[PDB]
């Protein structure tokens, strides 16, 4: 039972652990993303403002 | 169970982290051509203007 134990948790966290490692990515990805599209539509608003 | 944790964490960020480095070229990219567009749409609208 113990090694029952080891397996499910074991084998079911890693698969969540990935995930939210891979969530990771889009959180810091988007942080930067929307960083770039505020330069984006700051010089495309603000350059067609004129 | 500790090759399964880096089995699906290392193979699933792997893909999430190219994408994310793949936007990086689009929020770098639409920086630069939205750059480019307000200078093409200045010498347009402007010129055009008289």
Same mark, same amino acid.
């Given at each position: 039972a113990?090694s029952?134990?080891?397996?499910?948790?074991?084998?079911?966290?890693?698969?969540? @652990?990935?995930?939210a @490692?891979?969530a990771?990515?889009?959180? @810091?990805?988007?942080? &930067? #993303?929307?960083? &770039?599209?505020? #330069?984006?539509?700051?010089?495309?608003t603000?350059?067609? &403002?004129?």
């Amino acid at each position: 039972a113990m090694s029952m134990a080891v397996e499910s948790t074991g084998n079911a966290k890693a698969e969540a @652990e990935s995930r939210a @490692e891979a969530a990771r990515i889009e959180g @810091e990805g988007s942080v &930067l #993303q929307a960083k &770039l599209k505020a #330069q984006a539509l700051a010089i495309e608003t603000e350059a067609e &403002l004129e």
